[PDB]
Ligand binder design. Structure first.
Ligand SMILES: Cc1cc2nc3c(=O)[nH]c(=O)nc-3n(C[C@H](O)[C@H](O)[C@H](O)COP(=O)(O)OP(=O)(O)OC[C@H]3O[C@@H](n4cnc5c(N)ncnc54)[C@H](O)[C@@H]3O)c2cc1C
Ligand SMILES: Cc1cc2nc3c(=O)[nH]c(=O)nc-3n(C[C@H](O)[C@H](O)[C@H](O)COP(=O)(O)OP(=O)(O)OC[C@H]3O[C@@H](n4cnc5c(N)ncnc54)[C@H](O)[C@@H]3O)c2cc1C
Ligand SMILES: *SCCNC(=O)CCNC(=O)[C@H](O)C(C)(C)COP(=O)(O)OP(=O)(O)OC[C@H]1O[C@@H](n2cnc3c(N)ncnc32)[C@H](O)[C@@H]1OP(=O)(O)O
Ligand SMILES: *SCCNC(=O)CCNC(=O)[C@H](O)C(C)(C)COP(=O)(O)OP(=O)(O)OC[C@H]1O[C@@H](n2cnc3c(N)ncnc32)[C@H](O)[C@@H]1OP(=O)(O)O
Ligand SMILES: [Cl-]
Ligand SMILES: [Cl-]
Ligand SMILES: [Cl-]
Ligand SMILES: [Cl-]
Ligand SMILES: [Cl-]
Ligand SMILES: [Cl-]
Ligand SMILES: [Mg+2]
Ligand SMILES: [Mg+2]
Lengths: 437, 437
């Protein structure tokens, strides 16, 4: 079939590539509104930090290389401005020429993702971070202005990664956030090490703080404080790129996301939606779920490829919401329903804090593991782990447990790989099971 | 009930402790033939390497402390020399006085573990490593003789740990092993980095090599080579501590181990056996299993405690055989049936070699992950991972999958925790799944 894809990055380019793996005949075209396809979204903060300096790590392909290798046509600087689902075309704006045209499709795959929110100030020194265009512009602004002091706004994983990278680059960031609710995917009382790592490095932060006014480099804050900054990076949330979808027959929720079934089909025949734009359900509980992360974009890309050109019995089984961030020496990982969603269950919490590996063994660091379970059936609802070492391991194991409908009690049966550098004979995971009841 | 435990370490002291958690009234006595209870078996190589300096790390308890904290009586230098099972007593030799006596029991728990094998040479420079007495003697001998050149016999994981520790202490070890099957719980082709790490450090080794004769410090080998060594550590296997059991009604297998049911009961009422002495079965396949490792000792200890003083419906579900060792920069982990046991199944093998984490993120290294599955039912039979980073995480996840008899195909659904320092959007685990079709 003739396949059109909207968005040429984590969901879209991946999906198109996966289809080509299965189907060498179909015409495939991707429209991307910005300059680059296949940029490495998750690498961006590290590019800014000069931790990642090879351009080849910043983006996988140009349209020319992608066509040469895969015979997939990608048109950059082409923005889809409407979906004409009844006539099975999309309307596309060529942004170089400022002329629009219709492109027909047999199958349409929407992976437009989200855009960064902006505070709205009229400021030449303020930047958001979403793509490689943004990344290049930030790097260039730092160099042209000999930037030293940077204000980082917001305390989600993106902002936190950007802050760390600015620091490692040798700049001097200050972090502010409008509330004390930092790193919101993690249990609020488990985020202290973020603040400790800031303090340890004498990196200033202010919570319950906001930009009030900007006058050149002079920033006035809600607290009443007045400071001078060379640059500002705003990480104040994102919004779904769905405005171009609203006039079509595609069902959107009230927040502008696209609900999909387990084949990533929208309500409209022959139109799929994947990536950050799509909403689904949890795998382990009967609740809606939105998990705007890379795993989901990639998993959906594969499922859609099977749906269109492969085994159409392959369907999504729902999200677990596994997520993770590094901040200096610490790892913050969690899986399952969000803190705010726990209230829909009768639940209990169990926790253990123990060395990631043998107590007698050097280089040890306390790992805090917390598990929430449903009192009605003992099923695991959510897990969270924070520590310098071993948090990723414990959370991935618990992700696999939740995939298999394990009860908290059965965690005593988990057979850990034990030697002194790695764990304990009764691992933190086993201890959760013992401590449950 | 009156409880007697034989052996005061990984299985025995643990089980006694777990019973006390549930039962504060029963009299519990443990007999231990050697000097120390609750020594840290797994720390011993690292004590030798002076990685563990604080000997306090090598000994968790003294009998006096155990009685003060847990009201459990532990008699060291007390060797159980017979089990009089029909009268429900054990005969105990007080090694300090060489006088024996009977101790009555309502329940008897056997955790005597295993002893080091010896090559049997008449040599004052040869040592084995099984307890803290041995570690003390080795440490003392190194100092007293200013040991430099040390011959390490045996290539099992503990000998490898001892070798690394001797090297890091500043000594010059040579490794020999009677065959080429080093680190035998791992796939033979995947053990190459052991030899690479030896080579990189110019640590000599010879496989299919054996001691022929010992003449003071002059060692003559099967190969005909003659070398002088200051010390020899023999790691040539272990044997079950069951000689004191042979006169009783307890059934032993032809190798001197004790087959137990899922309640860790022997064939004799009121007698349990746990730890290295006990044999069981696999959880995921119908085959016998012996897994002489710490996790199994600890798990059986809790199950016996529940049987005796807690919830007696709690039973063992069998072993998976999860195991791991660090050797210099590399980790070697496997789980499931042993290499030689694969031939009892119709199976296929899937493998990937990919970066432990995002390719663009610094400090990356190749992680080799291999999965064997049963062709009759797609179930995972065995998995093995080797790499500088991430092998423990992948194998623990696969242990949790196998615990649930998950299929190789379902690995595509595993929801990994992804950020650049940790994994990939399609993790190695997912790739096994995608590559299994
Ligand atoms: C700085 C940063 C760091 C991140 N780190 C992590 C991480 O460590 N772990 C993790 O799991 N996730 C991380 N993410 C999240 C991640 O990248 C997303 O979940 C993923 O990119 C979603 O894929 P997508 O296809 O939905 O959106 P994208 O990959 O953002 O691609 C969407 C594309 O569609 C284009 N588009 C939108 N509308 C139109 C239109 N009307 N016409 C044509 N093109 C259009 C956009 O320009 C865009 O290029 C990070 C994101 C950022 C910005
Ligand atoms: C150097 C070394 C490193 C190791 N590293 C690891 C590792 O990294 N990971 C892992 O999972 N396992 C490791 N192990 C294995 C581990 O320690 C065992 O699996 C575990 O100790 C088994 O518990 P157990 O109670 O059966 O035997 P043990 O802990 O050895 O205790 C048994 C005790 O019973 C006593 N005893 C025996 N007979 C009598 C008797 N007749 N009367 C009175 N007392 C008696 C013994 O003297 C001994 O103290 C290591 C072992 C050694 C020696
Ligand atoms: S924010 C974190 C995520 N970031 C992003 O995703 C960034 C944007 N990504 C993209 O634009 C796409 O994911 C790109 C990079 C365009 C995908 O193109 P690639 O060409 O690099 O990678 P492929 O997916 O095409 O293939 C790479 C190799 O991986 C193996 N492989 C992929 N998919 C499969 C399946 N389904 N089954 C088995 N193996 C698979 C193969 O090694 C493939 O190369 P081979 O030549 O097939 O071996
Ligand atoms: S070779 C690797 C293994 N080798 C060894 O085990 C060496 C010798 N081991 C032993 O002698 C015992 O394992 C000792 C060291 C005596 C300890 O036995 P326990 O496993 O019973 O642990 P503790 O009683 O010392 O308590 C430690 C912490 O774990 C909590 N805990 C243990 N068991 C449970 C159960 N069943 N349920 C809930 N919690 C449990 C303890 O309460 C304790 O927590 P803290 O907050 O640190 O006190
Ligand atoms: Cl990326
Ligand atoms: Cl229309
Ligand atoms: Cl704790
Ligand atoms: Cl230990
Ligand atoms: Cl008798
Ligand atoms: Cl039996
Ligand atoms: Mg219209
Ligand atoms: Mg503690």
């Amino acid at each position: 079939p003739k396949i059109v894809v909207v968005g040429a990055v984590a969901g879209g380019a991946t999906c198109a590539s996966q289809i080509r793996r299965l189907d060498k005949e179909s015409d495939i075209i991707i429209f991307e509104k910005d300059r680059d396809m296949s940029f490495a979204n998750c690498a961006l903060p590290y590019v800014i930090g000069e931790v990642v300096e090879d351009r080849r790590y910043a983006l996988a392909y140009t349209p020319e290389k992608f066509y040469d290798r895969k015979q997939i046509t990608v048109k950059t600087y082409h923005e889809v401005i409407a979906i004409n689902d009844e006539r099975q075309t999309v309307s596309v704006l060529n942004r170089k020429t400022n002329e629009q045209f219709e492109e027909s499709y047999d199958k349409l795959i929407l992976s437009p993702g989200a855009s960064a929110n902006s505070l709205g100030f009229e400021s030449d020194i303020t930047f958001t971070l979403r793509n490689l265009e943004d990344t290049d512009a930030i790097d260039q602004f730092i160099k042209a202005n000999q930037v030293d002091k940077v204000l980082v706004v917001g305390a989600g994983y993106v902002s936190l990664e950007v802050l760390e990278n600015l620091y490692e680059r040798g700049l001097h960031p200050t972090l502010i956030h409008r509330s004390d609710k930092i790193n919101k995917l993690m249990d609020a009382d488990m985020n202290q090490p973020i603040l400790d790592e800031l303090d340890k490095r004498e990196i200033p932060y202010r919570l319950n703080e906001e930009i009030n006014a900007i006058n050149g480099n002079e920033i006035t804050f809600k607290s009443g404080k007045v400071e001078h900054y060379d640059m500002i990076i705003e990480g104040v949330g994102t919004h779904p790129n769905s405005k171009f979808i609203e006039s079509s027959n595609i069902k959107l929720d009230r927040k502008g996301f696209i609900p999909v079934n387990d084949k990533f089909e929208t309500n409209v025949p022959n139109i799929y939606a994947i990536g950050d734009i799509a909403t689904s359900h949890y795998r382990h509980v009967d609740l809606p779920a939105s998990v705007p992360l890379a795993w989901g974009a990639h998993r959906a890309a594969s499922i859609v490829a099977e749906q269109i050109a492969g085994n159409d019995t392959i369907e999504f089984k729902g999200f677990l919401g596994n997520n993770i961030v590094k901040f200096f020496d610490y790892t913050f990982a969690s899986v399952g329903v969000k803190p705010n969603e726990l209230k829909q269950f009768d639940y209990k919490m169990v926790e253990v804090t123990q060395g990631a590996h043998a107590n007698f063994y050097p280089g040890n660091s306390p790992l805090h593991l917390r598990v929430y379970y449903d009192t009605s059936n003992r099923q695991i609802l959510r897990a969270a782990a924070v520590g310098k070492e071993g948090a990723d391991k414990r959370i991935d194991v618990l992700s696999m447990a939740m995939m298999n409908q394990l009860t908290v009690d059965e965690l005593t049966e988990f057979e850990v790989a034990y030697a002194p550098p790695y764990s304990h004979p009764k691992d933190l995971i086993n201890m959760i099971g013992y401590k449950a009841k």
